[PDB]
Design brief:
The complex is a heteropentamer of chains A (about 55), B (about 220), C (about 230), D (about 290) and E (about 350). With about 55 residues, chain A is mainly α. Chain A contains 2 helices and no strands. Chain E is mainly β and about 350 residues long. Chain E has one domain: 7 Propeller (Methylamine Dehydrogenase, Chain H), CATH 2.130.10.10. Chain E is globular and about 65 Å long. Chain E starts with a helix and ends with a strand. The chains are: A mainly alpha (about 55), B alpha/beta (about 220), C mainly beta (about 230), D mainly alpha (about 290), E mainly beta (about 350). Chains in contact: A-E, B-C, B-D, B-E, C-E. The interface between A and E is large, with 37 and 56 residues. Bound molecules: ligand 9GF and the ligand Cc1ccc2c([C@@H](C[N+](=O)[O-])c3cccs3)c(-c3ccccc3)[nH]c2c1. The site of the ligand CCCCCCC(C)(C)c1ccc([C@@H]2C[C@H](O)CC[C@H]2CCCO)c(O)c1 has 17 residues of chain D, from helix 2, helix 3 and helix 9. Chain E: Keywords: Acetylation, Disease variant, Host-virus interaction, Intellectual disability, Phosphoprotein, Repeat, Transducer, WD repeat.
Chain lengths: ~55, ~220, ~230, ~290, ~350
């Protein structure tokens, strides 16, 4: 019933409300730092010369 | 003239191309008929007359193979998977024609034909089927004509103004949904007035698709 | 998974004969049909070929106009027909089917073969050792050399390291680059450096001791090197 | 000899009207080529392939023919036999290509009307391009090869009278081919209407549902009577004077009436793309959208 | 009795958004700025494929970073060799209507599934030289949305009703069932570490699902329409959601908030697919405006259009190392940019 299904909903919301969270600045900076770490091996980002020549013919 | 690996790996493309081009023209000889409209009303019986998920039915006559896409038990959003059926030749819509006389309703004090109208307006103005001509079937003719005598039609809808004859009362409600069409140039609506004792209830639609076929060719060559 | 081979016996030169192989209970409609001949004192050499669809047939260095492959899978008619048979053809034959993909394992499975007695710019590799006496309990390390550049522009070098247990049929060890094959224990290993190729066996058993052979062929003719039979 | 039967009073009028009609032809043909050659989905079907073939053939033929005609009459350049025969080949090649394009369009529509189930595979790009190239090769061959060998000075020729240096046998060959292709076009456009009317009658008789009359047959008649009327009114007298040319009777007026009948030959190419590439609902919608 | 239940419902709902509101510090644009943009960067098609007869719906890369798989309206699943354009082999399906195809990390198996609410799994590396149906999971009443292998033995599927299911290959019985979203589910992306996954729904909701625990870890609400595509960051702690309202958005798991919104006034039509590349630098999106945009994740500005498709772009993909970029649209061609 509506009352029976309301218990499940309120339980889900109250178990969701207590989950841990961190600031956006630290999470955003991780992706920016992640890009710098793997920046070198990015053929699409920095055009790699034709020394290795993939997909040639 | 490459190495031993490539001289034998460029023959794999040859066989796969020959299989693909051979099996791509075998499925181009079949017509595809959608049934986005209600089918559980009376069209099941019609399916049994010719001979959960998408229900594919295969039949044939007059050297044409028809693929009926009975979408009955999907029970999901009708907008997400509707573009997958774009390009079908025709859409078979079905009405039981035994509701105003019976006053079956049960849609929270609402007659079923208001819902049927709503469905017809939703499907006839759809963007994916602007070039597809709906084909409408009406079933349960005998029951309707036998119990129309005592049934007051004006009570359900006061807009009607006519007698109780079976061969004039039913014609009024056809425009109710037919006039809802916003594009009368190409999206024609057909009717057959099927019966459960009727023996030739599929030949009609066959003729219909021919009218859709030949005209379609005139769109390509340019005679129109 | 299995081969049914028909052919054998004693014949005379000039008499045409057909040697057939069938792969019942096994899909073979898209398999190349390498045919291999046994030298009692030397290595195996490839003698006939046909590809998928019967659209390509090859031949060895000195066999043009002598052999012919006929393949027809509807009736399981897959055989070799002999033309202009000569006396010096007393040998045994293997039939190996293999097809080529990316990442595939060419020559992954081998047939049984059959013997046959007859009344009486090619790339050549060098075997480091030959006719080595057999001794149990000793790890095996065998080297080989190539006449020309192994590395094709596609980057797929030909490094065949076939092994033959004492018995009826051989098995593959390395096919392209130091990669193990199917149906073989992990004790075996292979490696290469430039024109130097190496086969290694560390653990020994009643089945680890056998004969070994190598191929590196960018062209159509395929032929082993000198026989390195330990039993000899 | 001298076949320039001309008076400047009408010479100026003929020159200016021929120039105006040629400008009209090149303008409309350029517009048709621009609308078709977008390399979009329109290019896919062979019908627009044939339509563009007709458009480009008329575009080149009209300008070449008008340039040659103005150079011949208002400048009186007699030139030599070699250059003259080469110049006259282009007009014949262009006209034969145009008739072939009309024949191919008529055949395409005949196939569409006759059997509609298999039309999507019967007419396909490979067969279309094969027939296209075959027709072009036949046209160019009949245009250039016979003129190299067949000469009035050679043997058994009266020089075709009105034409300067044409054999009597060569003149009769072209007329028959053109008449046969025109007759086939007429037959196809008549059978299309016959089948459409039969289908409409079958639809009405059996009682199936779906402009009070038969919209299909009436619309097709309205579309396909104008084409026949235009074709007849454009190539009626020209195919008759050349027959009278074979007869051999020479008059002062007949040269003038032939010069006047050139109007119809140029007007046919003036008007054909207007009735072909614009009457189509698909083509008209494509032009309106883009 | 229902009044207090509803009251506590909006109280709990308001509690969560208040916590989210105080968590935000600054916009992503102000911290991702002050650096040089990639600029105008587009490339021609180095390869171009063929063979399909109808519109393609899904296609997946491989672990070897060369081999490919593709699925279309017709019952064909084709295996592609990207370097040399030759078709490795083709697999006939049982149902034409398919939306899901996937390639196993080991390369032994492939997964397919469409409108029949079933998930078929075929075996590639077969000793008998064929491709045979290894498994056929049937535990849904609807239509599959996305399939992503978790391992050689665990597969997570998204049903079309409301749910997701984590399966076992040997036994068709579901190992775990995730319920919620109060509506249909369209997209399902799986983390690189094979421990978490997300899902996009037709109710503008995105929920984190715990693979082992089996309960909703987090719930994300955004966009005013359906969600059609989602894909994890290569780091594995973020994702991007494409919606039918012609706007993409960026979400971070620990942040639990919106970061970046990608939209253009020129386009009004929605996104069909989204994908990433190496280092998470180029967010590629395939729309239904016949084009396929490529925008920086840090800066939403345009950086290149891979025009050249005659219909709506349906699929995407990138190599494991980040070398080439495949595509695919409702025209039967399947291009491989590089
Ligand atoms: C025999 C080839 C048939 C092509 C029909 C072309 C047409 C009938 C329109 C035609 C042909 C020739 C002329 C002039 C005819 C005069 O007898 C001599 C000078 C010609 C000038 C054309 C130069 O290209 C013409 O006005 C129309
Ligand atoms: C100004 C001009 C340009 C091209 C041509 C051609 C041929 C070209 N050629 O030499 O084959 C062409 C026809 C159509 C397109 S190009 C003929 C010609 C045609 C048939 C027989 C003899 C000559 N007169 C021409 C006059």
């Amino acid at each position: 019933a509506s009352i029976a299904q309301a218990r499940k909903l309120v339980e889900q919301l109250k178990m969701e409300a207590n989950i841990d969270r961190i600031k956006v600045s630290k999470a955003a900076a991780d992706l920016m730092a992640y890009c710098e770490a793997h920046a070198k091996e990015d053929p699409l980002l920095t055009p790699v010369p034709a020394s290795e020549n993939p997909f040639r013919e | 003239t490459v190495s031993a690996e490539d001289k034998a790996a460029a023959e794999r493309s040859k066989m796969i191309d020959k299989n693909l081009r051979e099996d791509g023209e075998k499925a181009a000889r079949e017509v595809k008929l959608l049934l986005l409209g209600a089918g559980e009303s009376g069209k099941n019986t019609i399916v049994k007359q010719m001979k959960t998920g998408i229900v594919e039915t295969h039949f044939t006559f007059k050297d044409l193979h028809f693929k009926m896409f009975d979408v009955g038990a999907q029970r999901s959003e009708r907008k997400k998977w509707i573009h997958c059926f774009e390009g079908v030749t025709a859409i078979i819509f079905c009405v039981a024609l035994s509701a105003y006389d019976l006053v079956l309703a049960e849609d929270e004090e609402m007659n079923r034909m208001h819902a049927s109208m709503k469905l017809f307006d939703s499907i006839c103005n759809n963007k994916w089927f602007t070039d597809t001509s709906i084909i409408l079937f009406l079933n349960k003719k005998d029951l309707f004509e036998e119990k129309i005598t005592h049934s007051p039609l004006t009570i359900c809808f006061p807009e009607y103004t006519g007698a109780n004859k079976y061969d004039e009362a039913a014609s009024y409600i056809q425009s109710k949904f037919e006039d809802l069409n916003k594009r009368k140039d190409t999206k024609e609506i057909y009717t057959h007035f099927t019966c459960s004792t009727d023996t030739k209830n599929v030949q009609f639609v066959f003729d219909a698709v021919t009218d859709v076929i030949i005209k379609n060719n005139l769109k390509d060559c340019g005679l129109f | 998974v299995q081969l049914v081979e028909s052919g054998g016996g004693l014949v005379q030169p000039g008499g045409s004969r057909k040697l057939s192989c069938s792969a019942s209970g096994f899909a073979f409609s898209s398999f190349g049909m390498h045919w291999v001949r046994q030298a009692p004192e030397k290595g195996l050499e490839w003698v006939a070929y046909i590809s998928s669809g019967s659209g390509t047939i090859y031949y060895a260095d000195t066999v043009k106009g002598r052999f012919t492959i006929s393949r027809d899978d509807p009736k399981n008619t897959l055989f070799l027909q002999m033309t202009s048979l000569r006396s010096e053809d007393t040998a045994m034959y293997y039939c190996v089917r293999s097809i080529y993909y990316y990442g595939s394992s060419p020559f992954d499975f081998w047939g049984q073969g059959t013997t046959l007695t007859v009344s009486s710019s090619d790339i050549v590799m060098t075997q480091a050792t030959s006719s080595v006496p057999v001794t149990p309990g000793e790890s095996v390390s065998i080297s080989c050399r190539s006449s020309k550049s192994l590395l094709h522009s596609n980057g797929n070098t030909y490094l065949y390291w076939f092994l033959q247990r004492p018995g009826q049929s051989p098995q593959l060890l390395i096919y392209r680059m130091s990669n193990l094959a199917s149906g073989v224990p992990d004790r075996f290993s292979g490696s290469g450096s430039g024109t130097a190729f190496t086969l290694t066996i560390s653990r020994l058993e009643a089945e680890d001791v056998g004969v070994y052979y190598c191929m590196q062929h960018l062209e159509y003719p395929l032929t082993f090197g000198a026989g390195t039979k330990l039993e000899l | 000899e001298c076949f320039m039967v001309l008076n400047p009073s009408q010479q100026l009028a003929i020159a200016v009207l021929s120039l105006t009609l040629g400008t009209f032809t090149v303008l409309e043909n350029l517009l048709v080529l621009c609308v078709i050659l977008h390399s979009r989905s329109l290019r896919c079907r062979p019908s627009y392939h044939f339509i563009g073939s007709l458009a480009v053939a008329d575009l080149l033929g009209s300008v070449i023919f008008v340039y040659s005609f103005i150079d011949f009459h208002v400048f009186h350049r007699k030139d030599s036999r070699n250059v003259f025969l080469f110049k006259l080949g282009g007009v014949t090649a262009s006209f034969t290509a145009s008739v072939g394009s009309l024949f191919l369009t008529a055949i395409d529509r005949y196939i569409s009307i006759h059997r509609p189930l298999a039309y999507k595979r019967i007419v396909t790009r490979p067969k279309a391009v094969v027939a296209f190239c075959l027709m072009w090769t036949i046209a160019i061959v009949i245009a250039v090869l016979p003129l190299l060998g067949w000469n009035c000075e050679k043997l058994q020729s009266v020089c075709s009278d009105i034409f300067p240096h044409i054999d009597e046998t060569y003149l009769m060959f072209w007329i028959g081919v053109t008449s046969v292709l025109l007759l086939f076009i007429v037959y196809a456009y008549m059978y299309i209407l016959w089948k459409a009317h039969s289908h409409a009658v079958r639809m009405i008789q059996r009682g199936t549902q779906k402009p009070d009359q038969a919209r299909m047959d009436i619309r097709l008649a309205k579309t396909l009577v104008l084409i026949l009327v235009v074709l007849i009114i454009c190539w009626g007298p020209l195919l008759a004077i050349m027959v009278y040319d074979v007869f051999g009777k020479m008059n002062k007026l007949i040269k003038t009436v032939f010069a006047f009948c050139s109007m119809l030959c140029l007007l046919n190419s003036t008007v054909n793309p207007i009735i072909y590439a614009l009457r189509s609902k698909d083509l008209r919608h494509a032009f309106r959208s883009m | 009795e229902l009044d207090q239940l509803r009251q506590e419902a909006e109280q709990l709902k308001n509690q969560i958004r208040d916590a989210r509101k105080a968590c935000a510090d600054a916009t992503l644009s102000q911290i991702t700025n002050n650096i040089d943009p990639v600029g105008r960067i587009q490339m021609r098609t180095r390869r171009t494929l063929r063979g399909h007869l109808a519109k393609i719906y899904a296609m997946h890369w491989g672990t070897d970073s060369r081999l490919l798989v593709s699925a279309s309206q017709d019952g064909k699943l084709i295996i592609w060799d990207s370097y040399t354009t030759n078709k490795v082999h083709a697999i006939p399906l049982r149902s034409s209507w398919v939306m899901t195809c996937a390639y196993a990390p080991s390369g032994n198996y492939v997964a397919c599934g469409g409108l029949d609410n079933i998930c078929s799994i075929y075996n590639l590396k077969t000793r008998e030289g064929n491709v045979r149906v290894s498994r056929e999971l049937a535990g849904h009443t609807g239509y599959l949305s996305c399939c992503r292998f978790l391992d050689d033995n665990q597969i997570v599927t998204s049903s079309g009703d409301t749910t997701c299911a984590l399966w076992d290959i040997e036994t068709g019985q579901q190992t775990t069932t995730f319920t919620g979203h109060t509506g249909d589910v369209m997209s399902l992306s799986l983390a690189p570490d094979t421990r978490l996954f997300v899902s996009g729904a037709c109710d503008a909701s995105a929920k984190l699902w715990d693979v082992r625990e089996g309960m909703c870890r987090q719930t994300f609400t955004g966009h005013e329409s359906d969600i059609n595509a989602i894909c994890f960051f290569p780091n594995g702690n973020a994702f991007a959601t494409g919606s039918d309202d012609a706007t993409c958005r960026l979400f971070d798991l620990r942040a639990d908030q919106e970061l970046m919104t990608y939209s253009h006034d020129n386009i009004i039509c929605g996104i069909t697919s989204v994908s990433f590349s190496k280092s998470g630098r180029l967010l590629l999106a395939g729309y239904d405006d016949f084009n396929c945009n490529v925008w920086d994740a840090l800066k939403a500005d345009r950086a290149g259009v891979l025009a050249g498709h005659d219909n709506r772009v349906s699929c995407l993909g990138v190599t494991d190392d980040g070398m080439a970029v495949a595509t695919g649209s409702w025209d039967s061609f399947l291009k491989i940019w590089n």
